[PDB]
Amino acid sequence: DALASVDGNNAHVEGSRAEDGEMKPTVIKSNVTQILRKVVRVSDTANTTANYGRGRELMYQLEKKGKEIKRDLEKILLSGQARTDVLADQYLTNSAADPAVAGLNDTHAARKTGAFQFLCAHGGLAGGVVDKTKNGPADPDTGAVTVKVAQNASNPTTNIGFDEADIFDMTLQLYTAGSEADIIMINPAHAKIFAGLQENTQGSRKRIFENTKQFIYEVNSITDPLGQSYKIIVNRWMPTDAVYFFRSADWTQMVLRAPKRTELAKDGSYEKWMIEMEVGLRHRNPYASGVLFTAAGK
């Protein structure tokens, strides 16, 4: 929900009757879950032996898989998939049911969640992933655009980065909307930008060193002209095509089926196991977090 933008210059006479105002309803969002899975298969013979630097081949392989699933999770929540699903306009399902895809079976397609990019003010799609070549829309009440395509006109075409000034433009958009974002998650390959704020054509807070035995060349904290103090964080599993401006409290992990133990059939010297868990992603407001894409310069 959001207040009305009918501020204008409302002026009323003294002796009139109360005229009907302009009321607008809320807006409902909806995201689907995704199924993660990691299978394990080890012959009984190998599981019976005693490896020279570990225990059984089953638990060791299970632990390796139990960690890979978490890595796959962090990479998907931070991806830009477009919530691939078959249903459409069936969330307020109260007047009837959806028998369009009811006479089907496991042949159904694979469901996908709405990643960071899809849940924000995305301007378009690319089949299954958010399109970065399109500038996102603006909020109805405010005029903020939390999805901005970096110009990079300051830097040349040799180095790409995203920009040095476009980082401050998002803080303006967030403040314009009222978001409380205080974290800037970035890929490690782009940290040289936030630390390498130089190359501004001889200006704009360049550099100096007082001939000291300490060379840092790092930037972790940031403050915008408005006063919003931001803290930069690095994530190895983040993509190298966008930057995220968000807040921890404005995100939540929706877990439907938690990872549990699943012993399957054998069929003869197989000893098959499996890991599986269904998880989704939520966002309190698409305009409560920023996404700064990356593009070339002039």
């Binding site: 929900d1 959001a2 207040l3 809320t26 078959v86 249903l87 969330y91 399902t93 049911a97 959806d98 895809v101 009811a102 089907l104 079976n105 496991d106 159904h108 909020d139 009440d141 405010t142 909307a177 009222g178 978001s179 309190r284 407001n285 305009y287 409560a288």
Partner: protein, 49 residues
Amino acid sequence: NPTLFVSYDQNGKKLSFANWISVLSPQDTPFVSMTGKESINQTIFSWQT
């Protein structure tokens, strides 16, 4: 009457109703907070310079 139980063939789907609503419209009002209030008794007020 589904034979293979799945999510898309269920006549139920009891929706999950979140217990909150998100709002970002700010009401800072820095000017009105620093001006000061003075009560009057006429639709028109005058001052001299």
